[model samples]
Structure formats: C-alpha cells, structure tokens
Target: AKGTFAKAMPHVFSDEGGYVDHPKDPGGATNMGITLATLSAWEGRKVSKAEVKALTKTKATDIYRENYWNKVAGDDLPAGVDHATLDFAIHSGPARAVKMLQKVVGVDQDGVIGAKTLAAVRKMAADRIINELCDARLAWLKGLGTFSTFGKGWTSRVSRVRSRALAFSRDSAL
Candidate 1:
C-alpha cells in the first residue's frame, strides 16, 4: 500500500475505474479494463493489472510528511489561495484545514486548518504519488505499473480538498 502511488492515482482520476473492487463490477473487470486503457493511452501499449501489481510490490517509498505544509505554502497560498484573504464559513478556517491535513497525513491531531496546511498535505500526497510513479517507471517504465497497486491511490482521492479551501471564500477560486 505504501509504494503503490502511481498505480492508484490514475484510478482515482478516472471516473469509471477509480474504485478498487468497484461495486458495479465485482470481478474487477471494469477496474482492470479502465487501468489497462489508461496505461495504453499513456504508453501506447497494452498492459495488464497483474503487471501493474507486480511493479507496485516494490520498496515502500517514504513521503516527507512534515515538509508538505511548507511546500504548499510555497506553491499555492501566496498565489491567492492564502487564507488571509478568505472568508471562512466555519468558526476557524486555518485551524480546521490544518486538522484535516494532519489527519490525512497520518500525523498528530492539530486542530488548525489553513491554506498552508492544505498546501502541505497536497504537496506530500503529490510527492508520494510522483515518487511511486518514478519507482514503478524505473521497474517497468512501461505497462507494468499501470494499475492494481495499493496505498498509492490515496493521493488523488484526497485532491478534492484542494479546491475546498476556496469554498471558505466566495471569490476564492475565481
């Protein structure tokens, strides 16, 4: 689950094959098909889920969880996603976002959610996904790591929170 980022992100991004063991196709035919299709689109070749699973079973890549918040502050906040400019509906915006980020990062509970916190979680998650992709690519660099991996999918699943910060401000995403 730890090192399976790349394989999982694509699934999360896709609408049809996103969920592993998706309810519609209990046998996973749909999931496998969607993964193979995505991989084929990217690499111009056919790939099986088994090959992707094999590649994801490699070393457990580590994400710099603590450093994520810093990266987010650097990337998205100052550019306009900053909480200082937001009108948070909740009693505490930064505190709430921070808590959400910490929860997602598997870190200690910190009841302070802010743009910086969201950014940090995004960066950490993105970094892990990228690392997983790199790992899978190095091993196969083809269709081997197309899908069927675990732990890596969490990155994309949480991405919705990226825009959620804008909800705090009526004109945030604008």
Candidate 2:
C-alpha cells in the first residue's frame, strides 16, 4: 500500500495563515488550505472566521487525512501517483483529482476509484502516469478563471509536485 500523506503534507502546509480572503480565491478564510467552508463542513455546522483562524496543525492533519487523503484513496495508488493525486486533491477537490487520474488512465471519468480505475492505474508506468496527470492538472488550472490571478503559483506547484513525485517513484523502485 502507498504511504504518500506524510511525504506530500509539507507541500500542502507550505501556505499557513488565517483568513486569506483573496477576492480571486474561492476558498475564503483559508488556513493551511483548510477553508472556513471546509472546516464548517467537517464540524457539522457553520463556523466563524475566528474559529478557522484558530486551527491547529494536529486538527489540520486530521482533516487532510480524513477528507483529502482517504477520500482520494491515496494509499491505494502507486507511490508517485499517490502524491500526485494528493497534491491535486489539495488544490482542486478529491473528485477532481480522481477524475483526472481516471482520465489519464483511460478509465471512466466517474470521479470514484473502483477496481477498474485501480487496475488501469496499475497497468501504467508510474512515471508516465505522474507526468500525464501533472500535465492535465496544469492544463485544467490554466483554464480556470482565476488562472490570471494564480497561474504562476499553480504552475510552480505542479512543476514541483511532478518533480517530487517522479523522485518518489524512482525511490520506490530502488
């Protein structure tokens, strides 16, 4: 089984702050990518901006593990592919990440990882899949309305994730 959460977590936590209400950012009141809306959903009710700002690392880790990692089935994927999917899931959503993976693997774009999706993913070379997924992610990000506002950062992120994922894939094979 894959263990990508710990390896990819640092990238997710690269941004740390409270209430980053950038007009272009759809995720309002974000702290380490834990938006107020996401926190509210996790907490089963509405939460204040102050509550979001008061998020702790442990809480953030739990949320990332449960909401993003598990939701995307990261542990079930190849090493490099897991981190690539997880990084995308953090930026986009779990469903979007899974859909992207399915697209690259030539599986149904059902946004859910079933046996067919897993088998298809396993059939591909890890490096090839990582590259294709990163390329697709970059293209999708470029098409987003916020690309002008956030394109540079998104591009850098995809590049870094691709490099790191490829390294992980190489390491796993050794």
Candidate 3:
C-alpha cells in the first residue's frame, strides 16, 4: 500500500492495545507498543516507566512512523508488502524486517533497502512476498524462548497480518 500507512495504523493500534507493564515481558512500561527505552530514545533522554504509561497514541504513532515505517521505506514498498513489513519491523526491528524482506526478494541479505531492493520487490508477486515474509516472521517468532509466554498472540497477529496484507494485495491487483 503506497498510501496505506494511514489505513494500516488503526489495525496496529488495535493489536497493540494500551498501557502494559507485564512482569513477564522484557519491554517495560509499554503503551501503544512503545517501550520505555524506545520512547526515551525518541525523546533524546531517559523517560520514566511512568512516562511510557502516560504516552499518548499520537506521540506513539509519531514514533512508529519515524522509526518503523520510515525505516522500512513504507512509502516506496508495494501495497501489501509495505504493511506486512511495517508490522514486522514494529515487532522486531526495522533492519531485521528489512533483511527478511530482502531475503524474500532474493536481494543481497543486506538490510538497507535502496533502489535495487525496491526494484526487486516490485518485480515479485506481492501476494507471494506477503506470504513468505509473514511466514518467515511466524517461524522466527515460534523459535523464540518467550514463545511460551507470547506465542499465542504473536501467532494470531501474524495470521491476521497475513490476511490483511493479502487483502491489500488483492485490492491493488492490476
């Protein structure tokens, strides 16, 4: 979705929910999926756990856009692929997501998405790219030690993400 960033964020918010400081989770004082560390980095200083709790979705959205979406070059990616990659980046990190995308697209496994990766992505079937990339993410998530703690929700979100990304692919089919 070249212009689907606006359309994609609501689903993200729904999946992320509100403030949470779960003891089992490593990310402390997370709200809108932004960790205290992430927010602190964004603010250029140490933000308190309470600061993360008090974070507004608007500011979190800004951080997601700046750190995740922009890092993935969402605007340059094809419709379905962009949204899928964006979510993966949000969950993991942008470079990891981009590297996985490069793997799916048969690029040099280097994470930095430039003209070559973009061109290769455009050449592939968007549906295939979405399925392979999302499936790869699922497999990686399943292998995590915290899978017992977060596996269910993580798997479910991956499934939902695959479905939505495919829908976008279908919608934009030429």
Candidate 4:
C-alpha cells in the first residue's frame, strides 16, 4: 500500500498547536521556528493529540521547547496549528504547508499542492528535525518519543530522494 505518515494519520489529529519558543532563547527563535516548520513539513501530520496533551499536561512542553529548539517561531508551526497566534506564523494546514516547503526546498514550486509534494516535505522536515535532535545535550528529551529510529531512518532515505526530486523539480521548472 505504501502509505505514508500523512496518509496514516486519522483526520481527527488536525488543528494541533504549532511549535513555540522556550522562555530562555529569543534570538535564534525565527531560525529555530523555520527549522521546525521545515521538519514538520517533512513529517506529514500536523500536531498530534499526544503533542497537545504534552503542552497542557506535563513538563514535556518545556523539554520540547528547550531540547528541540531554543525558541519556537510562528512559521515553525504546522498548518492548522491550534494556537491562534502561532497559526498566523505557519500554515494552518500541515499538508498545505508541506507543499509550500517542498517548493522552498527546491521542489517544483508550482504553487499547486498535492499528496506527492506533501510526502516529500514530510520526509525533509523529519530528516532535519531528527538530525537536530541527535545532538548530545538533547539526549534527555529524546525520551519524549517524537524522534524514532524507524522514522528517522525513513526520513534519512527521504532526504536523499528529495535531493534527487529537487533536481527533477528544478529541471521541470526551467
């Protein structure tokens, strides 16, 4: 069936909150946000209920904010993010945002959204997000479970595929 993470998620998972910054770091916030946004594009699902629960329920939110990034920016959020202010920075629809990110990542830039583009974006975002999380200081937070070997490995492969896709996309654009 070759179902992707996007296709796998149930529709109820939509409207999750986008990424936000930790209280300590505000300077790298925008870049950090963009990085997460890019990563979110790589993963397909926007915010999960589990993620929402973390924000409201536990210290996981603080860990997520600090370990994943120093400061979360608006654009870093997935599309259809639940938070009012955060949604403004990123796409409200995660799928749509991934399409946009694909274009930015050197995909067709067609402005016409589709599932193929969404998949590619998810792969890319996931790859970068995992790479950033792999560092030592963030080791504690890895327990949160956003990062996974199967997921990371899958994204790593997708990154390679995306590199090739970008070339094809560029060629088509020309």
Candidate 5:
C-alpha cells in the first residue's frame, strides 16, 4: 500500500552525502542533504560537524522519511505525482512543493494538500501535471541567486526527476 515511499526513496537519496562546501549551498556540511543543523534538530540534540560528515545511509533515510516524505504527505499522493512532489520537497521544502502543486493543479496555494487538492490533481493528466511541475521547479531554481554556481547540477536533477516521475506515472497506469 505504501510502495510509493519505496519507489521514491531512490530518487531522493540519489545524491549520496558528502562534504560539499559550495559557497551558495545553504546546507552547510551536508551529507545526503542532511545538514548538520537539520540532523541536530531531528535528533533533538547537538550533532557535531564531524558526525554529519560521517552520516550513515540508514540515518539519512530515516531523516528523509520523517522530515520530507511524511511532511509532504507523499503516500497520499498519486504515484507519479507523489514522486515528483516528494522529490521537489526534498530539494526545496514541503511547503514550497505543496504550493507549487497547488498552483499547477489550480487549487489554493495555502501550502497544504487536502481533499480539494487531491481531487483536483486526480482529475488532471498525470503527464501534464508532472511536466508542469518540473517546468515550474526549473524556473524557480533558475531564478535563485545560487543558480550561477549550482545551476548545471540542479538542472540535471530536475530533468532526471521529470523523466523518472513520468515513467512512474506510466508504470502506475499499467
């Protein structure tokens, strides 16, 4: 029933953690996107930079499920939509991803997906929705101040997510 999580986790964790101190990267000392600050907050205790540097896959997966997937209500979304939304939520945040979905699905942009949002999404063509969401995501990322520094990688990631999400949608249809 909850297979969406299993399918989407691979995309979310594609960028396995490492010490990347890009000046534009807000996630300082990130490992699999689990920044030192985020891990500390999740654990409810201080976590050293060294600990963040050595973050294990298990810990990263736990944090991703708890903080990103559940926060975005990924399991409640339709297959392709779930992967697209959760992927964006992982890169950006749940609220932003939800807002994007709301905008694309012609619902209120209150940053929360409820029955109304779900109904609207269900009525739309999944491929169209996936393309629109990825288009919007790429546009937003291009507008960021850090685009000059991280644009290439971000563009590639968004492209990959679009392809994967569309594939997931097709598979779900089968």
Candidate 6:
C-alpha cells in the first residue's frame, strides 16, 4: 500500500470531481470532495462556503492523508485492497470503509485497522479483497436513499475503482 498512494490518488480525484452543491447531495459546500466542515477543521477555524471552494488540491491531499488513507491504514494493507479501502473511506467514512474491510476479511467489525484485521487481509489475495470489498460497497450504496440521486455516478465510480484496484493488484505482483 505504501507504493500505491500515488497510483491510487488519480483515480480518486477523477471520480470525486469538483465543487458540488446539489440539493440532492445533502451536505455543506463540497469542493474536491472536502466539505465546508471538513475544510474548516483543516483550517483550524470555521470557514465559509466560499472558503471550501478555495481549497487547494495540496491541502485536500493532506486532509485525505490524515482523515482517510491513514485512518484506514493504507500503508499496512495490500496494494489493490488499500486503494479500494481508500476509495470507500473517501466516499463514505473512514470507519465505514474499515468496517467493510473487516467484514469482508472476516475480522471483528470494530472499524479499527489493528494487527488482527491486517493479518486477515494478508491471508487473502489483494484482488479477492478488492472484489469482496467492492461488491459489499456497491450493495451498501445501492441500498441508500441517496442512490436514487447519485446512483449512476456512484455506481460508475465503483466500477472504475474496481478496475483500477484490480490493475493495482496485477501490477504489484511484479
């Protein structure tokens, strides 16, 4: 997973898109997938909606590192599985993503990336983890009420991530 952060970010950025304030989105101003609240947290003060719009990709990456990738312990997971989990973390929540991984890997769904969870992931192939994780992710997404609004986009996003995740696994085998 250490070798995959750079490789995985492009795919995440491509799917996250730019600022979106759709009535259906059900959130504060979100730019680069960083919401007003999240950006405010990073800025160490309450930032306005326009400030969320002003978020830089550099700072966005930093927030993602601290809030998503690191929370999911991407550095300790397998390559493809790491990216797949990061995708979920960014799209959903870190705890949700970690719980999904824990569920798929047959670990306690405590939503913490501890040694036992990592070992379970280690016991499986990265590609298998990607499939199970992605499938479970889609199932959860498809069940959400927001699916009626963001369904198509999120579904396509999952497919793209799945393909890139598998490619990550294949490439890492070298």
lDDT, candidate 2, 1-174, per-residue tens: 355677678766875443466745566768777888788988999999888888888898999999988887888888888888888988888999999999999999988889999999999999999999999999999888889988998898889889988888877542
Model 5 accuracy (lDDT, Cα): 0.82
RMSD to the hidden true structure, all candidates: 17.1, 1.9, 1.7, 15.4, 2.2, 1.7
TM-score of each: 0.22, 0.92, 0.93, 0.20, 0.88, 0.92
Q: Give Cα distance to truth, residue 96, candidate 5, Å.
A: 0.8
Tell me the tens digit of each residue's lDDT in model 6 across 1-174. Answer: 787888777766776788888754587668888888788777889898788777889999999988889999988888788889998998888999999999999999998899999889999988999999999999999889889988999888899889988888878452
Using TM-score, give the best candidate's number. 3
Candidate 5 C-alpha lDDT tens digits along 142-162: 888889988999899988888
How many steric overlaps are in each model, in order?
Answer: 13, 0, 1, 17, 1, 0
Q: Residue-wise lDDT of candidate 4 within 1-174, one digit each (tens)?
A: 111212212221232234444436322222213333333433455644334323431333333233222222222433221121112113223333333344444567443334554445446544342233222113322453544533454345334333432332233222
lDDT of each: 0.33, 0.85, 0.88, 0.32, 0.82, 0.87
Off by over 4 Å in 2: 15-24
Of candidates 4 and 1, the better by TM-score: 1
Can you list the residue pairs that collide in candidate 6? Answer: none
Least accurate 10 contiguous residues by lDDT in model 4: 80-89
lDDT of 3: 0.88
- List candidate 4 segments past 4 Å from native: 1-146, 172-174
Most lDDT-accurate candidate: 3
Query: Residue 87, candidate 2: how far off, in angstroms?
Result: 0.7
Q: Report the Cα lDDT for residue 149, model 5.
A: 83
Candidate 3 residue lDDT tens string, 5-117: 88899988987789988866676678988988789889999998889889988899899898999999998888889889998998888999999999989989777789999
- Model 5 sits at a Cα RMSD from the real structure of 2.2
Considering lDDT, where higher is better, how would the candidates rank from best to worst? 3, 6, 2, 5, 1, 4
